Structures are given as C-alpha cells and as structure tokens.
Design an enzyme around this catalytic site. Sequence first.
Site, mmCIF file in Angstrom:
data_model
loop_
_atom_site.group_PDB
_atom_site.id
_atom_site.type_symbol
_atom_site.label_atom_id
_atom_site.label_comp_id
_atom_site.label_asym_id
_atom_site.label_seq_id
_atom_site.Cartn_x
_atom_site.Cartn_y
_atom_site.Cartn_z
ATOM 1 N N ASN A 19 0.821 -1.193 0.000
ATOM 2 C CA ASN A 19 0.000 0.000 0.000
ATOM 3 C C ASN A 19 0.866 1.259 0.000
ATOM 4 O O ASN A 19 1.745 1.388 -0.847
ATOM 5 C CB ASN A 19 -1.065 -0.008 1.135
ATOM 6 N N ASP A 20 0.622 2.176 0.926
ATOM 7 C CA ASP A 20 1.353 3.440 1.001
ATOM 8 C C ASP A 20 2.809 3.481 0.542
ATOM 9 O O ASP A 20 3.647 2.756 1.075
ATOM 10 C CB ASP A 20 1.313 3.949 2.429
ATOM 11 N N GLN A 36 4.620 0.292 2.208
ATOM 12 C CA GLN A 36 3.950 -0.464 3.255
ATOM 13 C C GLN A 36 3.751 -1.877 2.696
ATOM 14 O O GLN A 36 3.145 -2.060 1.637
ATOM 15 C CB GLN A 36 2.615 0.197 3.573
ATOM 16 N N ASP A 145 2.196 9.243 10.065
ATOM 17 C CA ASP A 145 2.744 9.622 8.767
ATOM 18 C C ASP A 145 3.575 10.901 8.720
ATOM 19 O O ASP A 145 3.211 11.865 8.037
ATOM 20 C CB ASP A 145 1.612 9.717 7.746
HETATM 21 O O1 LIG Z 1 -0.190 0.934 6.239
HETATM 22 C C1 LIG Z 1 -0.217 2.020 7.158
HETATM 23 C C2 LIG Z 1 -0.533 3.314 6.423
HETATM 24 O O2 LIG Z 1 -1.863 3.218 5.802
HETATM 25 C C3 LIG Z 1 -2.729 4.274 6.231
HETATM 26 C C4 LIG Z 1 -3.559 4.738 5.044
HETATM 27 O O3 LIG Z 1 -2.765 5.202 3.966
HETATM 28 O O4 LIG Z 1 -3.705 3.844 7.250
HETATM 29 C C5 LIG Z 1 -3.325 2.902 8.303
HETATM 30 C C6 LIG Z 1 -4.537 2.398 9.090
HETATM 31 O O5 LIG Z 1 -5.539 1.697 8.324
HETATM 32 C C7 LIG Z 1 -5.187 0.472 7.681
HETATM 33 O O6 LIG Z 1 -5.535 -0.699 8.464
HETATM 34 C C8 LIG Z 1 -6.988 -0.989 8.568
HETATM 35 C C9 LIG Z 1 -7.174 -2.205 9.447
HETATM 36 O O7 LIG Z 1 -6.510 -1.804 10.972
HETATM 37 C C10 LIG Z 1 -7.559 -1.188 7.147
HETATM 38 O O8 LIG Z 1 -8.962 -1.476 7.208
HETATM 39 C C11 LIG Z 1 -7.307 0.091 6.350
HETATM 40 O O9 LIG Z 1 -7.790 0.002 5.000
HETATM 41 C C12 LIG Z 1 -5.814 0.389 6.279
HETATM 42 O O10 LIG Z 1 -5.496 1.566 5.543
HETATM 43 O O11 LIG Z 1 -3.960 1.568 10.073
HETATM 44 C C13 LIG Z 1 -4.151 2.132 11.381
HETATM 45 C C14 LIG Z 1 -4.529 1.042 12.348
HETATM 46 O O12 LIG Z 1 -3.459 0.101 12.397
HETATM 47 C C15 LIG Z 1 -5.230 3.224 11.213
HETATM 48 O O13 LIG Z 1 -5.028 4.359 12.057
HETATM 49 C C16 LIG Z 1 -5.178 3.616 9.745
HETATM 50 O O14 LIG Z 1 -6.493 3.863 9.248
HETATM 51 C C17 LIG Z 1 -1.742 5.362 6.764
HETATM 52 O O15 LIG Z 1 -2.284 6.213 7.761
HETATM 53 C C18 LIG Z 1 -0.602 4.559 7.334
HETATM 54 O O16 LIG Z 1 0.596 5.323 7.385
#
Ligand SMILES: OC[C@H]1O[C@@](CO)(OC[C@@]2(O[C@H]3O[C@H](CO)[C@@H](O)[C@H](O)[C@H]3O)O[C@H](CO)[C@@H](O)[C@@H]2O)[C@@H](O)[C@@H]1O
Length: 536
Positions: A19-20, A36, A145
């Site tokens: 992802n990210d 990510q 982030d």
């Molecule tokens: O990978 C981390 C990275 O992704 C971001 C979005 O760009 O969000 C992280 C977050 O959500 C992820 O995890 C949930 C399941 O816990 C999933 O449903 C969702 O689609 C994901 O994006 O993970 C934390 C919880 O662990 C949340 O606060 C956040 O929504 C980004 O913020 C981060 O740097």
Amino acid sequence: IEQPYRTGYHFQPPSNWMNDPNGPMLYQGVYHFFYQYNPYAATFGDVIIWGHAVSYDLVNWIHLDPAIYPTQEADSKSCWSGSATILPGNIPAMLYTGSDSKSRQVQDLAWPKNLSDPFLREWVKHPKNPLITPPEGVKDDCFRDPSTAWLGPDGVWRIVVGGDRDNNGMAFLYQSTDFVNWKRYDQPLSSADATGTWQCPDFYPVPLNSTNGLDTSVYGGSVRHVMKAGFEGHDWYTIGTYSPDRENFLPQNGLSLTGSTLDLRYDYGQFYASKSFFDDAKNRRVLWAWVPETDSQADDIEKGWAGLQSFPRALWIDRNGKQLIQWPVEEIEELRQNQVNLQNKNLKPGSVLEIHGIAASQADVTISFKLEGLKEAEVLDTTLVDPQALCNERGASSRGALGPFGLLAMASKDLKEQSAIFFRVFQNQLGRYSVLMCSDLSRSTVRSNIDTTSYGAFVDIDPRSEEISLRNLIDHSIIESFGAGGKTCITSRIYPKFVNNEEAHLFVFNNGTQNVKISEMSAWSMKNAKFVVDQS
Ligand SMILES: OC[C@H]1O[C@@](CO)(OC[C@@]2(O[C@H]3O[C@H](CO)[C@@H](O)[C@H](O)[C@H]3O)O[C@H](CO)[C@@H](O)[C@@H]2O)[C@@H](O)[C@@H]1O
Ligand SMILES: *[C@@H]1O[C@H](CO)[C@@H](O[C@@H]2O[C@H](CO)[C@@H](O[C@@H]3O[C@H](CO)[C@@H](O)[C@H](O[C@@H]4O[C@H](CO)[C@@H](O)[C@H](O)[C@@H]4O)[C@@H]3O)[C@H](O)[C@H]2NC(C)=O)[C@H](O)[C@H]1NC(C)=O
Ligand SMILES: *[C@@H]1O[C@H](CO)[C@@H](O[C@H]2O[C@H](CO)[C@@H](O)[C@H](O)[C@H]2NC(C)=O)[C@H](O)[C@H]1NC(C)=O
C-alpha cells in the site's frame, strides 16, 4: 494467460500486499522506493514492514529485502508510512510511524547503517525512539505519517504529522535543530473540520512559471507551497503561501480544505497515500501514489497479491498558478516500441474505430480532438455539479451533443467489456463552456463483486481555442488517464474477464450527435519494465 491482471511496467512487489509508498528519495545516484508491505498475505496484516527497491531510472527496479521492520519497542508492532529527508552532510534520515508495545502510534527515526552501500540495504534506528508521541488532546490511533522535513531560513527543521483533534483533521507541525529533539508547534500548519484523521500529509514548494521541481527547503515570492493531505478516502491539496518565520500557511483560494467538490485532488480515481520527493538529478518533483485493488479480497488472496503504484509522475504548478500539473516521468518513453498513428481522421456520430497493431493491454496512447459545432453544446451550468456523480449518471451509452467521445481501453473484441475514458462539453445560460472528463468503468467487466464505480472530473480548458487532448497509460489492471496535458488525472483499476483467454483491444469512439475530428492520435506498445529480485 497466467496472472492476467499483473501490470507490465508499474511498480509492485513480486507478490502479497502493498500500500502506502514510503520514503521516496534520490540518493547518491540511486532512486530509492519503499512501501507499506505485508510479507504474509495479499491482505493488510498486523505486521506491516517497509518494502525496499532501487532503480536508476524509476522504471526498472531491483527488489531488495525490507529496510524498516520492527526491531524496537518503539515499533514492536508494525512500521507504518513515513518520509525520507536528506540532511546536510548527505545522510538520509527516515522518519516513520511505528506501532509500539502499547499499540500507540509514535514517530521514530532511522538512517542507513552502511552509507557506502549504493543500495542502502541495512538500516539502523535511533536509541531515543519514539522521538515524538501523541500530543495533549490526540488519541493514540490518530497521530501518524511524518512528512519530509524542510529547513527554515533560520536553520531549523520542520515536519508535519497527520492526525486530528475531535475528529477535526490536521497537520501537526514540529521543529528541531538536530533532527532528534522535536518540539511541537502550538498550532497546526493546516486544518479542516470533521474530516477525520489526516493521512500522509505532504508539504513542499513549487517554482512559479516553471515546470521544474524545488528542494523542500525553498522559500520565496516565485514560490508557492502545497499542503497535501489524505482524508475521507482521497488525496486533497491546496496551493498557498508559506512563511516559515511567522509559521503560517495561507491557502491561495483563501479556503480551508473541505473534501468537498470545491477542493483540488491530484487524481480523481483510485489514488491514495500519495507522496512526492525532489529529484535533484533532473530538477523535478516526482509523485508516487498507491492504487488500491478494486476487486474482492477473496480475489486478492486468489491471485496472490494486492496493491499497485501509479507510474511515477513529474509535478509542477500550472502556468496560471491555480492548480498543479502532473505527467508521467520521461523515462517511461524508453519502454515505447512500435507506434501506430492517426491524423485528421473524423469520428462521425455513433462511431467506434479500432486501433490496430498495438499491445492493447500494455500501451501508451495520446489523442487530441478537434471539436465541431460547439454551438450545439448541451446547456448545463456546472457550478455546483459533482463530476463523479455526472459520469456515473451518464456513461458512454448516454449520447449527447458533444460527447461522449474518447477511448475504449481494455475492451473485448465484441465490446462486451470496455473501459471508456471520454469527454463531454457543456455550456451555461451565458455561453461559457465546461469540459467533463470521465472513466466509465461501469461496463469495464462482467465479473461480479468487482467495484465498477466510474470516476469523473471537469477539465480546465477552453474548448473554444484548445483541442481536448487525452493520454492513457494502459497496463492490464490499471489505466491512468491524463486529460489536457496533466490538468485532470484519473486512475482506474479494471478487471475485465476476457483477459483470461482472448486478447484486449483499443478503440477510439464518438457516441455524441456531433462530429469530432481526431486531429492526431499516437499509440505505442509498451515493453515490460525490468524487476530483478535480489533478496533471500
Ligand atoms: O499501512 C499504514 C498506512 O496506511 C494508512 C492509510 O494510507 O492507514 C493505516 C490504518 O488503516 C489500515 O488498516 C486498517 C485495518 O486496521 C484497514 O482497514 C485500512 O484500510 C488500512 O489503511 O492503520 C491504522 C490502524 O493500524 C489506522 O489508524 C489507519 O487507518 C496510513 O495512515 C498509514 O501510514
Ligand atoms: C553494509 O552493511 C553491513 C555493515 O554495516 C554488512 O552486513 C553484514 O554482512 C555480513 C557479511 O555478509 C553478515 O554476516 C553474516 O554472518 C553470518 C554468521 O553465521 C553468516 O550467515 C555469514 O557469515 C559467514 O559465517 C562465518 C563468519 O562470518 C564464516 O565462516 C563464513 O565465511 C561467513 O563469513 C554472513 O555473512 C552480517 O550478518 C550482515 N549484517 C547486517 C544484516 O547488516 C554489509 O555486508 C555491508 N555491505 C556493504 C560493504 O555495502
Ligand atoms: C453508444 O450509445 C448507445 C446508446 O445506448 C449504446 O447502446 C447500448 O446501450 C446499452 C449499453 O449501455 C445496451 O443495451 C447495448 O449495449 C446497446 N443498446 C442500445 C441502447 O442500443 C452503445 O453501447 C454506446 N456505445 C458504446 C459501446 O460505448
């Protein structure tokens, strides 16, 4: 046709979930990309680490072993998104959000352990981690982030961290002189009411009247600043003026971000967690963005992977300074093979013309239309209209005066399945013209449980003195549409069924009632990118 949805020239790990995009940077001649990653599935996991890859041209990559993964209590549970800043003395410093023992979201530091390794493989962490923890009124799951830092003229570093207070999203600003001891600044660099947590904030400068990039630490009158943030599912941004001294950012439009049809976006389709970085080797700013899968999770597990990265694109402010322009980095042209060209070809109403001799599923297509009879443009004031709503209401099958005219990418020989990227031209009761751009993914696939939402956006050009142009990077399960040279971008994920047996096709079409002439169109078959794997 094994793995019919894998891209041929877009970045993506050998397998699993991605992802990210993380800490992008150009160091010592090597383009570093991070992301990510979940080493165990094609689904987000409890253990997310930083994937690593290197390149000399942003097109062909060498896969490396992860760089940042839990090795401290400060990130014992996971290593989430962050940004790379190259401090004076030429040492890359990586700031990222970790999930510590007590599942809080904290800001950690890390830098290359072997600075003489061209590929910066091994990374070491600071002992003082976490360098920053959720401020006074912030939840432990609403602070993350960290952005790339910028050095104020007063020689003081600055960074923004996503978050929110009372669901009011914001970019928390921090300062330091040594990059280790960060002091939170009383007010955020920017806010927005009830938008939820702000993610992957990005703050950087852009040279006025120029198509080049600027290092994050440039200030001036010939410079404007961009406050980008992701919230409510999209990546929004706003061009404004930044005063490092007074420490305040004033958006040009004089409006705080909303996430309403009033704000700007980099892309208007599948485009998230976008992050840029400066390429001093070519004096340009490159933008990276995660393009999520739009099929089912079952599908992801099935094919064994999920997530793609939009092709790296150059970024700069429009000549009028009201919006940003993006364009695929030039290196992509190296992948071009043979070309098919059309010129001065008229598309009569209800037409569909097939582009022959192209790798229809992996191509680079540019077309430019010459409009006939703007007078007949349908009358519609688009002042408060939502383009995505409109493109979803009126698909390629909704014939109009001027439009729909455009392309049919990843289409069946019989057009059972097709992805239509097109335009529509309207006019208000005052004779002023508006141009709409669409990505009609409605008929993109006959498969079930596939998100086929269409995306749309108005294009800021006067069809009364400019040919509407469109460029598409077609790569199997992703299509990136660039309307009018980069003024309007739309990324789409499509999973047609036919790809599993028969080949794809490419069509130009006009389903309006007016004629459109293709002044010129050029298509190239794109050869694969090279992805060597150096891991173990
Ligand atoms: O990978 C981390 C990275 O992704 C971001 C979005 O760009 O969000 C992280 C977050 O959500 C992820 O995890 C949930 C399941 O816990 C999933 O449903 C969702 O689609 C994901 O994006 O993970 C934390 C919880 O662990 C949340 O606060 C956040 O929504 C980004 O913020 C981060 O740097
Ligand atoms: C830059 O980064 C690192 C320096 O900061 C360095 O990484 C280390 O590299 C060494 C050698 O490759 C790794 O050593 C391993 O040691 C285990 C021990 O069991 C072995 O698997 C193997 O060594 C062997 O074991 C014996 C003793 O070493 C000997 O009989 C064998 O001949 C053989 O040496 C491995 O080599 C070490 O774990 C790495 N540490 C890490 C993860 O950083 C990079 O090589 C260096 N690269 C450069 C110069 O850019
Ligand atoms: C051009 O517009 C016509 C007008 O509708 C489209 O016609 C199709 O409409 C439906 C598809 O949405 C289906 O019923 C058939 O495919 C066809 N039926 C009609 C009304 O004739 C046509 O598909 C459009 N061209 C394309 C393929 O974009």
